[PDB]
Coordinates of C-alpha atoms and ligand atoms in Angstrom, one line a residue:
Chain J
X1 CA 45.8 8.4 -24.9
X2 CA 42.6 7.5 -26.8
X3 CA 41.0 6.0 -23.6
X4 CA 37.5 4.7 -23.8
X5 CA 35.0 7.5 -23.0
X6 CA 31.7 6.7 -21.5
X7 CA 28.7 8.6 -22.9
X8 CA 26.1 9.3 -20.2
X9 CA 22.7 7.8 -20.9
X10 CA 19.3 8.6 -19.5
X11 CA 16.2 6.5 -19.8
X12 CA 13.2 8.7 -20.7
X13 CA 10.3 7.1 -18.8
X14 CA 6.8 8.5 -19.1
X15 CA 3.4 8.5 -20.8
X16 CA 4.4 10.9 -23.6
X17 CA 4.4 7.8 -25.8
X18 CA 0.5 7.9 -25.6
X19 CA 0.3 11.4 -27.0
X20 CA -1.4 11.6 -30.5
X21 CA 2.1 12.0 -32.0
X22 CA 3.5 9.0 -30.1
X23 CA 5.6 11.4 -28.0
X24 CA 7.5 13.0 -30.9
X25 CA 7.2 16.6 -29.5
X26 CA 8.3 15.5 -26.0
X27 CA 11.2 13.3 -27.2
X28 CA 12.4 16.0 -29.7
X29 CA 12.6 18.5 -26.8
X30 CA 14.4 15.9 -24.7
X31 CA 16.8 15.1 -27.6
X32 CA 17.7 18.8 -28.1
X33 CA 18.3 19.4 -24.4
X34 CA 20.5 16.3 -23.9
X35 CA 22.5 16.8 -27.1
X36 CA 24.0 20.0 -25.7
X37 CA 25.5 18.1 -22.8
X38 CA 26.6 15.0 -24.8
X39 CA 24.0 12.8 -23.0
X40 CA 22.2 10.1 -24.9
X41 CA 18.4 9.7 -24.4
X42 CA 17.2 6.1 -24.2
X43 CA 13.7 6.5 -25.6
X44 CA 11.0 3.8 -25.2
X45 CA 9.9 3.9 -28.8
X46 CA 13.4 3.8 -30.4
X47 CA 13.8 0.9 -32.8
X48 CA 10.4 -0.3 -31.7
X49 CA 9.6 -4.0 -32.1
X50 CA 6.1 -5.4 -32.9
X51 CA 5.7 -7.9 -30.1
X52 CA 4.8 -6.8 -26.6
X53 CA 7.4 -9.0 -24.9
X54 CA 10.1 -7.7 -27.2
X55 CA 9.2 -4.0 -26.5
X56 CA 9.2 -4.8 -22.8
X57 CA 12.5 -6.5 -22.9
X58 CA 14.2 -3.7 -24.8
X59 CA 12.9 -1.1 -22.4
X60 CA 14.2 -3.2 -19.4
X61 CA 17.5 -3.4 -21.1
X62 CA 17.6 0.4 -21.6
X63 CA 17.1 0.7 -17.8
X64 CA 19.9 -1.8 -17.2
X65 CA 22.1 0.3 -19.6
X66 CA 21.3 3.8 -18.3
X67 CA 23.1 6.0 -15.8
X68 CA 19.8 7.5 -14.7
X69 CA 16.0 7.4 -15.3
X70 CA 14.1 10.7 -15.6
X71 CA 10.5 9.7 -15.1
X72 CA 7.4 11.8 -15.9
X73 CA 5.1 11.0 -13.0
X74 CA 2.5 13.6 -14.1
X75 CA -1.2 12.8 -13.7
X76 CA -2.2 10.3 -16.3
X77 CA -6.0 9.5 -16.8
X78 CA -6.7 11.0 -13.4
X79 CA -4.5 12.0 -10.4
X80 CA -2.3 8.8 -10.5
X81 CA 0.9 8.5 -12.6
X82 CA 1.2 6.1 -15.5
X83 CA 1.6 2.5 -14.4
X84 CA 4.1 1.7 -17.2
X85 CA 6.3 4.5 -15.9
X86 CA 5.8 3.3 -12.3
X87 CA 7.0 -0.2 -13.4
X88 CA 10.1 1.4 -14.9
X89 CA 10.8 3.4 -11.8
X90 CA 10.6 0.1 -9.8
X91 CA 13.0 -1.7 -12.2
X92 CA 15.5 1.2 -11.8
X93 CA 15.2 1.2 -8.0
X94 CA 15.9 -2.6 -7.9
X95 CA 19.0 -2.1 -10.1
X96 CA 20.3 0.8 -7.9
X97 CA 20.1 3.3 -10.7
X98 CA 19.7 7.1 -10.1
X99 CA 16.0 7.8 -10.4
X100 CA 14.8 11.4 -10.9
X101 CA 11.1 12.1 -11.1
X102 CA 8.9 15.1 -12.1
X103 CA 5.2 16.0 -12.2
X104 CA 3.0 18.8 -13.6
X105 CA 1.1 18.6 -10.3
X106 CA 3.1 18.7 -7.0
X107 CA 0.1 18.9 -4.7
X108 CA -0.2 16.2 -1.9
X109 CA -2.5 13.3 -2.9
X110 CA -5.1 14.4 -0.3
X111 CA -5.1 17.9 -1.8
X112 CA -5.6 16.4 -5.3
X113 CA -8.5 14.2 -4.3
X114 CA -9.8 16.9 -1.8
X115 CA -10.2 14.3 0.9
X116 CA -8.6 11.3 2.7
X117 CA -10.7 9.1 0.5
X118 CA -11.7 9.0 -3.2
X119 CA -15.2 9.0 -4.6
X120 CA -15.5 5.2 -3.9
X121 CA -14.3 5.6 -0.3
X122 CA -10.9 4.2 -1.0
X123 CA -8.0 5.6 1.1
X124 CA -5.8 8.4 -0.3
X125 CA -2.3 8.3 1.2
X126 CA -1.3 10.9 3.8
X127 CA 2.4 11.1 3.6
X128 CA 2.7 14.7 2.2
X129 CA 3.7 13.3 -1.2
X130 CA 2.2 13.9 -4.7
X131 CA 1.8 10.2 -5.6
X132 CA 2.1 6.7 -4.3
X133 CA 4.9 6.5 -1.7
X134 CA 6.7 3.7 -3.5
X135 CA 7.6 6.2 -6.2
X136 CA 9.5 8.5 -3.8
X137 CA 13.1 7.6 -2.9
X138 CA 14.2 10.8 -1.1
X139 CA 15.3 12.8 -4.1
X140 CA 13.3 16.0 -4.6
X141 CA 10.2 15.7 -6.9
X142 CA 11.0 18.1 -9.7
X143 CA 8.5 20.4 -11.7
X144 CA 9.8 19.5 -15.1
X145 CA 12.1 17.4 -17.2
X146 CA 14.6 20.3 -17.4
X147 CA 14.9 20.7 -13.6
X148 CA 15.4 17.0 -13.2
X149 CA 18.1 17.1 -15.9
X150 CA 19.9 19.9 -14.0
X151 CA 20.1 17.7 -11.0
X152 CA 21.5 14.9 -13.2
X153 CA 24.2 17.2 -14.5
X154 CA 25.2 18.3 -11.0
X155 CA 25.2 14.8 -9.6
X156 CA 26.4 12.6 -12.4
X157 CA 29.4 14.2 -14.0
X158 CA 31.5 12.9 -16.9
Chain Z
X1 CA 19.0 -34.9 9.9
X2 CA 17.5 -31.5 10.9
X3 CA 18.6 -29.8 7.7
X4 CA 17.5 -26.2 7.2
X5 CA 14.1 -26.0 5.6
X6 CA 13.2 -23.0 3.4
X7 CA 9.7 -21.7 3.9
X8 CA 8.3 -20.4 0.6
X9 CA 7.3 -16.7 0.7
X10 CA 5.0 -14.7 -1.5
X11 CA 4.9 -10.9 -1.7
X12 CA 1.2 -9.8 -1.7
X13 CA 1.2 -6.7 -4.0
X14 CA -2.0 -4.8 -4.7
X15 CA -4.3 -1.9 -3.9
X16 CA -6.2 -3.9 -1.1
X17 CA -4.2 -1.6 1.3
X18 CA -6.5 1.3 0.2
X19 CA -9.7 -0.5 1.2
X20 CA -11.6 1.1 4.1
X21 CA -10.3 -1.8 6.3
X22 CA -6.7 -1.2 5.1
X23 CA -6.9 -4.6 3.3
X24 CA -7.8 -6.7 6.3
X25 CA -10.5 -8.8 4.6
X26 CA -8.2 -9.4 1.5
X27 CA -5.1 -10.2 3.6
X28 CA -7.0 -12.5 5.9
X29 CA -8.2 -14.5 3.0
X30 CA -4.7 -14.6 1.6
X31 CA -3.3 -15.7 5.0
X32 CA -5.8 -18.6 5.3
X33 CA -5.1 -19.8 1.8
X34 CA -1.3 -19.7 2.1
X35 CA -1.2 -21.3 5.6
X36 CA -2.7 -24.5 4.2
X37 CA 0.4 -24.9 2.0
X38 CA 3.0 -23.7 4.6
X39 CA 3.6 -20.6 2.5
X40 CA 4.3 -17.2 4.2
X41 CA 2.5 -14.1 2.9
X42 CA 4.7 -11.0 2.9
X43 CA 2.1 -8.3 3.4
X44 CA 2.8 -4.6 2.6
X45 CA 1.3 -3.4 5.9
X46 CA 3.1 -5.9 8.2
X47 CA 5.0 -4.1 11.0
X48 CA 4.3 -0.8 9.2
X49 CA 6.6 2.1 9.9
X50 CA 5.6 5.7 10.1
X51 CA 7.9 7.3 7.6
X52 CA 7.3 6.9 3.8
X53 CA 10.9 6.0 3.0
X54 CA 10.9 3.3 5.7
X55 CA 7.6 1.7 4.4
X56 CA 9.1 1.8 0.9
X57 CA 12.4 0.2 2.0
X58 CA 10.6 -2.6 3.9
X59 CA 8.5 -3.4 0.9
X60 CA 11.4 -3.5 -1.4
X61 CA 13.2 -5.8 1.0
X62 CA 10.1 -8.1 1.1
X63 CA 10.4 -8.3 -2.7
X64 CA 14.1 -9.1 -2.4
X65 CA 13.2 -11.9 0.1
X66 CA 10.3 -13.4 -1.7
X67 CA 10.1 -16.5 -4.0
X68 CA 7.3 -14.9 -6.0
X69 CA 5.1 -11.9 -6.2
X70 CA 1.3 -12.3 -6.7
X71 CA 0.1 -8.9 -7.9
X72 CA -3.4 -7.6 -8.0
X73 CA -3.5 -5.6 -11.3
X74 CA -7.3 -5.0 -11.1
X75 CA -8.7 -1.7 -12.2
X76 CA -7.9 1.0 -9.6
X77 CA -9.5 4.4 -9.9
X78 CA -10.4 3.7 -13.5
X79 CA -9.2 1.1 -16.0
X80 CA -5.5 1.3 -15.1
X81 CA -3.9 -0.9 -12.3
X82 CA -2.4 0.7 -9.2
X83 CA 0.9 2.4 -9.7
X84 CA 2.4 1.2 -6.4
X85 CA 1.7 -2.4 -7.4
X86 CA 3.2 -1.7 -10.9
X87 CA 6.4 -0.3 -9.2
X88 CA 6.5 -3.6 -7.2
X89 CA 6.1 -5.7 -10.3
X90 CA 9.0 -3.7 -11.9
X91 CA 11.1 -4.3 -8.8
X92 CA 10.5 -8.0 -8.9
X93 CA 11.2 -8.2 -12.7
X94 CA 14.6 -6.6 -12.2
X95 CA 15.4 -9.0 -9.4
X96 CA 14.4 -12.0 -11.6
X97 CA 11.6 -13.1 -9.3
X98 CA 8.6 -15.1 -10.4
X99 CA 5.8 -12.6 -11.0
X100 CA 2.2 -13.8 -11.1
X101 CA -0.6 -11.3 -11.9
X102 CA -4.3 -11.2 -11.8
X103 CA -7.2 -8.9 -12.5
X104 CA -11.0 -8.7 -12.0
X105 CA -11.2 -7.4 -15.6
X106 CA -9.4 -9.4 -18.4
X107 CA -10.7 -7.4 -21.4
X108 CA -8.2 -5.9 -23.8
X109 CA -7.4 -2.2 -23.0
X110 CA -9.1 -1.1 -26.2
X111 CA -12.3 -3.1 -25.2
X112 CA -12.2 -1.4 -21.7
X113 CA -11.9 2.1 -23.2
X114 CA -14.2 1.2 -26.1
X115 CA -11.7 2.9 -28.5
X116 CA -8.1 3.2 -29.6
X117 CA -8.0 6.5 -27.7
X118 CA -9.3 7.7 -24.3
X119 CA -11.6 10.7 -23.7
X120 CA -8.7 13.1 -24.1
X121 CA -7.4 11.5 -27.3
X122 CA -4.5 9.7 -25.7
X123 CA -3.6 6.4 -27.2
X124 CA -4.8 3.1 -25.8
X125 CA -2.4 0.2 -26.3
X126 CA -3.2 -2.4 -29.0
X127 CA -1.4 -5.5 -28.0
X128 CA -4.4 -7.7 -26.9
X129 CA -3.4 -7.2 -23.3
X130 CA -5.6 -6.1 -20.3
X131 CA -3.1 -3.4 -19.1
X132 CA 0.2 -1.6 -19.9
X133 CA 2.4 -4.1 -21.7
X134 CA 5.3 -3.5 -19.3
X135 CA 3.2 -5.5 -16.7
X136 CA 3.0 -8.6 -18.9
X137 CA 6.0 -11.0 -18.9
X138 CA 4.5 -14.0 -20.8
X139 CA 2.9 -15.8 -17.8
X140 CA -0.9 -16.1 -18.1
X141 CA -2.9 -13.2 -16.6
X142 CA -5.0 -14.9 -13.9
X143 CA -8.6 -14.2 -12.9
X144 CA -8.0 -14.2 -9.1
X145 CA -5.5 -14.5 -6.3
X146 CA -6.4 -18.2 -5.9
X147 CA -5.7 -19.1 -9.6
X148 CA -2.3 -17.3 -9.4
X149 CA -1.6 -19.2 -6.2
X150 CA -2.3 -22.6 -7.9
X151 CA 0.3 -21.7 -10.6
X152 CA 2.7 -20.9 -7.8
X153 CA 2.2 -24.3 -6.2
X154 CA 2.7 -26.1 -9.5
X155 CA 5.8 -24.2 -10.5
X156 CA 7.6 -23.4 -7.3
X157 CA 7.7 -26.7 -5.2
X158 CA 9.1 -27.2 -1.7
Ligands
12B201 O1 3.6 0.4 -22.1 C1 4.4 0.7 -23.1 N1 5.7 0.7 -22.9 C2 6.2 1.1 -24.1 C3 7.5 1.3 -24.6 C4 7.7 1.7 -25.9 C5 6.6 1.8 -26.8 C6 5.3 1.6 -26.3 C7 4.1 1.8 -27.0 C8 2.9 1.5 -26.4 C9 2.8 1.1 -25.1 C10 4.0 1.0 -24.3 C11 5.2 1.3 -25.0
12B202 O1 1.9 3.1 -1.5 C1 1.9 2.4 -0.5 N1 2.7 1.3 -0.4 C2 2.5 0.8 0.8 C3 3.0 -0.3 1.5 C4 2.5 -0.6 2.8 C5 1.6 0.2 3.4 C6 1.1 1.3 2.7 C7 0.1 2.2 3.2 C8 -0.3 3.3 2.4 C9 0.2 3.5 1.1 C10 1.2 2.6 0.6 C11 1.6 1.5 1.4

């Protein structure tokens, strides 16, 4: 009786932090969705430090502490995902964490750029993926945070 | 006598692979520089597979096998570094590898964008760093592959 109970935790990776509201609207939506399932969101801006290295270390620790990352790999400042988010996905991959990704634009990279090269003649990947192939681990690329979260619930039970 | 001798290895992360020559000119320069010091370059396109997941896995393994990563975080398709490279930097950080980064543009992000926000009113980081703060671990940001390599030689001896 009164055994320890693990509360599931998801690291909320993505460029919402750069919204004018520092991601408040996104994180609030995430908080409400996860609350219903007794899942804790690990949010990049929580208890935010002032020094870059401290912010970075705390985020790395959240990834170490999580059961899954849900990463927003939507276009950021062009057709490419946010590099901070990409770093976090790599961290999670190395730590053998469940990584779930979504994007607002699921078109292949070559469809996005409209060619096999960009405007400067740099190669656009041709693997039938919406973004850099390093970011794809075989799990479906979802359309939304919600759809990724449904996969989490089905595949990481309490 | 005849003890095993470790050959130092560096993972060569960066968007050179997207050059029209698939990085040949960049990688050849790297190869020539490293051979002089008996250091082996681990190059993303070496023995390249055909399936995205196989390429990804081989690159992650190269990072697991390396002594350091030297990562080209130069502007790619705008002021942001390449997300594949960022993923690799994250992978290396999680694995406690030495990570050395360089860029052709060392200006602060706010100097690059000319404002604290981009054209779409999205926040530009203000930490006096040239790129997303997740990509900075306290080691100096170098100006070139060569200067990063000099740090490697001074800080990872045979
Ligand atoms: O790159 C970032 N990772 C982060 C985690 C938490 C907060 C903030 C704020 C600005 C920029 C970044 C950031
Ligand atoms: O995103 C990539 N990581 C890679 C590692 C090695 C080769 C190639 C080729 C195209 C695209 C990518 C790539």
